[PDB]
């Protein structure tokens, strides 16, 4: 089953699988696709076409083949896809057994 997680900019995300399971990322986006999510100043929530597909790769590297993963959604990991638009991290993933 696919699990979904979301964390606003500067806040941390923790993807977690029960017991000894492996995290397998299926989707990951750091940017903006909705104006009513992750409150901010109205003008900082304008762009709705802010997408960063590199997040899929970055998330997979930092989380795949692990039991739990954690990433702060910010300038520490991802760069600035839509400068001036408060971004958010949306990661979908499924828990699978080891080899």
């Amino acid at each position: 089953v696919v699990r979904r997680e979301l964390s606003c900019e500067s806040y941390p995300i923790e993807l977690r699988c029960p017991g000894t399971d492996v995290i397998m990322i299926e989707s990951a986006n750091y940017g903006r696709t909705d104006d009513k999510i992750c409150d901010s100043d109205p003008a900082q929530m304008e762009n709705i076409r802010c997408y960063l597909p590199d997040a899929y790769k970055i998330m997979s590297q930092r989380c795949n083949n692990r039991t739990q993963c954690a990433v702060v959604a910010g300038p520490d990991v991802f760069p600035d896809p839509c400068p001036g638009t408060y971004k958010y991290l949306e990661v979908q993933y499924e828990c699978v057994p080891y080899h």
């Epitope: 500067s10 100043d41 109205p42 003008a43």
Partner: antibody
């Protein structure tokens, strides 16, 4: 040594009409960059009056028509501290000034969930 | 900037205050003399952490309201509303809730 969200204000004191004063709102436990800093004042026995804000994220600023031209708000994110420079002070500016924060990412859409202790500015000759 | 409006009330009463200052961005605050204000309700209807359940907010058109279901002794103070008017913030005039005797 344990962290906590707190807004500590400094810079208050006595000024003479036409003079100037600098108020400072130092932030602990969160980053001003991910917040909008507002100054709100209250004269003795009166209501709350918002004066000015700054959102270091986009650095846009807004000022109350009563303070526009005499008051300038700014922020230094490397010091996690917002400032309110008040020039050409007049008697009607006498009031306790409180700095407040709107933390992004919590649903508040403008709410102020942490205020400073407040500092008093008395503008009189 | 005006001085707070007065509302004489008794323990057990129900007070429904309406906001006049201009978004869905209404927030309500309680202040007692000599202390900084405290957030009660944000985003029209959301109860802030640690605030008693008796406090509530609602929206009916341009009519945003703060309602205390049952007045308790420490609820007697001044209450302010806030509205995000584009690039401007506007507090209401204030309601000081005083006791009847």
């Amino acid at each position: 040594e344990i962290s906590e969200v707190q807004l500590v204000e400094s810079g208050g004191g006595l000024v003479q009409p036409g003079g100037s004063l600098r108020l400072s709102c130092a932030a602990s436990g969160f980053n001003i960059y991910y917040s909008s800093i507002h100054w709100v004042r209250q004269a003795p026995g009166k209501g709350l009056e918002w004066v000015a804000y700054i959102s270091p994220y986009s650095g846009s600023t807004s000022y109350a028509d009563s303070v526009k031209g005499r008051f300038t708000i700014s922020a230094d994110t490397s010091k996690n501290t917002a400032y309110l420079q008040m020039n050409s002070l007049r008697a009607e500016d006498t009031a306790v000034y409180y700095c407040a924060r709107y933390k992004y990412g919590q649903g508040h859409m403008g709410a102020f969930d942490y205020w400073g202790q407040g500092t008093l500015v008395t503008v009189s000759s | 900037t005006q001085s707070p409006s007065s509302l004489s009330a008794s323990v057990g009463d129900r007070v429904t205050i309406t906001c006049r200052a201009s978004s869905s961005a209404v927030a309500w605050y309680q202040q007692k003399p000599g202390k900084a204000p405290k957030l009660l309700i944000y985003s029209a209807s959301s109860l802030y952490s640690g605030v008693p359940s008796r406090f509530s907010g609602s929206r009916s058109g341009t009519d945003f309201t703060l309602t205390i279901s049952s007045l308790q002794p420490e609820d007697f103070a001044t209450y302010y509303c806030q509205q995000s008017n584009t690039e401007l913030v506007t507090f209401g005039q204030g309601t000081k809730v005083e006791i009847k005797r």
